[PDB]
Every structure is written in C-alpha cells, then in structure tokens.
Amino acid sequence: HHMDYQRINEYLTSIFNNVLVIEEVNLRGSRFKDISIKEMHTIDVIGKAPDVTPSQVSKELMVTLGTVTTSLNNLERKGYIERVRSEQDRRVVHLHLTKKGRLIHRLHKRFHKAMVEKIIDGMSEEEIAVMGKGLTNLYQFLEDLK
Amino acid sequence: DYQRINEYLTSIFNNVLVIEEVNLRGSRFKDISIKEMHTIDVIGKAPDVTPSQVSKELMVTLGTVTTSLNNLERKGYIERVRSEQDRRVVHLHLTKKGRLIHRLHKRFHKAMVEKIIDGMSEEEIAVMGKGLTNLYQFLEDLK
DNA sequence: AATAGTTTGACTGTCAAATTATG
DNA sequence: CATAATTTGACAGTCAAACTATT
Numbered sequence: 322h323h324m325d326y327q328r329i330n331e332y333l334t335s336i337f338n339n340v341l342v343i344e345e346v347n348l349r350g351s352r353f354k355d356i357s358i359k360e361m362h363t364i365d366v367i368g369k370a371p372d373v374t375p376s377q378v379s380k381e382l383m384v385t386l387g388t389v390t391t392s393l394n395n396l397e398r399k400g401y402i403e404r405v406r407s408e409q410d411r412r413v414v415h416l417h418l419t420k421k422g423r424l425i426h427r428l429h430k431r432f433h434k435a436m437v438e439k440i441i442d443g444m445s446e447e448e449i450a451v452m453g454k455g456l457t458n459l460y461q462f463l464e465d466l467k
Numbered sequence: 468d469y470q471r472i473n474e475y476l477t478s479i480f481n482n483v484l485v486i487e488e489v490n491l492r493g494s495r496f497k498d499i500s501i502k503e504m505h506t507i508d509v510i511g512k513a514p515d516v517t518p519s520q521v522s523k524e525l526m527v528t529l530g531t532v533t534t535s536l537n538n539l540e541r542k543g544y545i546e547r548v549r550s551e552q553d554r555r556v557v558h559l560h561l562t563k564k565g566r567l568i569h570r571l572h573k574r575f576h577k578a579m580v581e582k583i584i585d586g587m588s589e590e591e592i593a594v595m596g597k598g599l600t601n602l603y604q605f606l607e608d609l610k
Numbered sequence: 611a612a613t614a615g616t617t618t619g620a621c622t623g624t625c626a627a628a629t630t631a632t633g
Numbered sequence: 634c635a636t637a638a639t640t641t642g643a644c645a646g647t648c649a650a651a652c653t654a655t656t
C-alpha cells in the first residue's frame with residue numbers, strides 16, 4: 322500500500338523547509354565556525370575538481386559570476402582557497418583548496434555520508450539497488466520539467 | 468556510490484527549487500519568494516499560529532520571522548491579530564489573497580507528486596517511501 | 611523575573627551593470 | 634568584439650542583541 326499523501330506532503334515539507342538550516346547548524350557547531358552552507362557548496366565544487374575556474378563554479382552552482390567572485394574573495398580571505406592565474410590564458414583563474422579547505426571539505430562529507438546511511442537504514446541490498454534506480458528516474462523527471 | 472546517491476539527492480533538491488521558483492514567478496503573484504510561500508503554507512495549514520510557532524517550524528529566529536511577517540502583511544497576504552486572552556501573543560491568519568495562493572500552491576504540489584508516483588513501479592514506490600521516511604527522521608533527529 | 615514579539619545594526623547572498631585585462 | 638574575471642550598486646534574508654509590552 323502507498324503511503325498516505327498527507328504523510329508524504331508532511332515529510333517533504335519538513336525536509337525542504339529545514340534541510341539547509343540543519344546542515345548549516347552542523348557546520349556552525351564544528352571546529353570551523355566561519356563557513357556557511359552556501360560557502361560550503363563553493364568549497365565542495367573546488368575540492369571535487371582541483372583547478373576549476375570561477376566560470377565553471379558559476380555553471381555548477383547556477384549563480385552568476387559576480388556572486389562566485391564575492392564568495393571566493395571571502396573564502397580566500399578566510400584561508401580556505403587559493404586563486405592561481407593561468408599561464409596559458411592570462412584571463413583565467415584556477416582555484417584550489419588550502420589545507421584548511423581540504424579539512425572542512427572532509428567534514429562536510431561525513432555529514433553526507435551519515436545522511437545516506439540513515440536513508441538506507443533497514444533496506445536490503447536489492448532495495449538499495451531499487452532506490453538507486455528510483456533516484457535516477459526522479460532526477461530525470463525533474464530535469465525534463467525545466 | 469554513497470557519493471553519487473548524494474549527487475542525485477542534491478540535484479533533485481536543486482531542481483525542485485528551480486521548478487518552484489519558475490512556477491511562482493510565472494504566476495499572478497509576482498511579489499512572493501519561495502521562503503514566503505513556505506511561511507504562507509505554515510499559516511494556511513494552522514490558522515492562528517503564532518510568530519514563535521512559525522519560528523520553530525521553519526527553524527529561523529523570531530526576529531527573522533517578524534520581518535518576514537511585516538513584508539507579507541504589507542503585501543496583503545497575512546493579518547496579525549492580538550490574542551484577547553494574552554496580549555503579548557499574536558495570532559496569524561491568511562487573507563483572502565493568502566488563501567488563494569496557498570490553495571494554488573497545495574494543488575501544484577499534489578499534482579506534481581501524484582504525477583511522479585504515477586510513473587514509478589510498485590517496488591520503486593515502496594522503497595522511495597522508506598527512504599523518504601528515513602531522510603525525514605535523519606533530520607528530525609538532529610533538530 | 612519571565613515571556614512574546616519587535617526593532618536594530620551588521621553581514622551574506624544574490625543579480626545586473628559598469629569595469630579591467632586579455633584573447 | 635568576445636571572454637574571464639572583478640567591482641560596484643541595490644536589494645532580500647538572516648542573526649544576535651537590545652528593546653518594548655504584557656503577564
């Protein structure tokens with residue numbers, strides 16, 4: 322039997338209203354207290370893709386380049402990232418995480434890992450495989466709606 | 468693999484916000500953010516909710532709520548009414564316009580969710596339901 | 611002393627527009 | 634002229650702390 326729509330709606334509403342606040346609260350209680358969840362997203366892009374450029378971070382985060390530049394200025398000032406001028410094209414900037422950046426990037430991954438482990442709690446390996454297919458299908462449905 | 472589950476969850480979450488934003492900005496209510504829609508929905512679902520209860524539900528400070536409520540009240544979506552039993556207390560209620568957008572928003576969400584469920588296999592729905600429950604509980608356990 | 615709500619000052623996140631340098 | 638980035642201007646949204654009013 323399907324879940325009641327009322328319960329579905331209730332769960333989705335809690336999740337969408339609170340998930341970014343809960344993630345921010347977890348970072349603010351960490352040993353690094355000067356990084357917001359939005360800055361953590363910028364850190365995340367750079368950590369996964371060393372030498373990425375501001376333009377690529379912009380496309381990946383779906384905000385304008387001015388917005389990315391401001392965030393990078395705060396993050397460089399606070400010691401989490403370094404900007405490096407390209408030697409091929411002198412218009413281009415390559416970004417990479419400082420050691421401090423790598424440390425907090427790791428910490429944000431433990432959170433994501435705890436979340437996925439709770440998501441699959443009680444599921445068998447075949448249910449997990451089905452859940453994987455469910456997510457790609459839900460993802461694909463939403464992609465086609467924009 | 469946990470990292471790619473995470474990649475899908477983030478893209479899904481991000482797509483949902485994009486789709487909500489486009490539907491809002493394409494509507495006849497062009498002065499309402501996604502966050503204000505959330506506040507309207509809290510008040511619509513619980514008539515006479517107080518600012519403190521809104522603050523608890525959305526997990527923002529009360530001052531942030533007051534500011535938002537001033538904006539929504541100015542723009543014609545909500546009304547504040549002082550409690551007759553305790554005059555420190557404010558009860559919130561949607562205006563006619565607030566009920567209209569609330570009703571249109573609930574319909575939009577229901578249709579979309581039903582459409583999504585319609586395209587899934589019985590086994591997908593069983594397990595997506597269990598993951599939704601678990602995700603809800605993960606967050607609820609951190610509050 | 612306590613509680614519910616508001617106001618205030620500062621800062622982030624965000625986009626558009628104007629700007630600097632480079633191709 | 635196009636591209637990559639930055640800076641500026643102008644707004645929401647947010648928090649912490651101070652304040653007001655009421656119990």
Ligand SMILES: CCCCCCCCCCCCC
Nearest residue numbers: 324483579583592595596599
């Ligand atoms: C508002 C659109 C996002 C909703 C997608 C989530 C749907 C969850 C369905 C779970 C099925 C449980 C029965």
Ligand SMILES: CCCCCCCCCCCCC
Nearest residue numbers: 340476477479480595598599
């Ligand atoms: C920050 C991303 C986590 C929130 C993702 C919510 C998406 C809702 C999909 C529900 C299905 C879960 C199995």
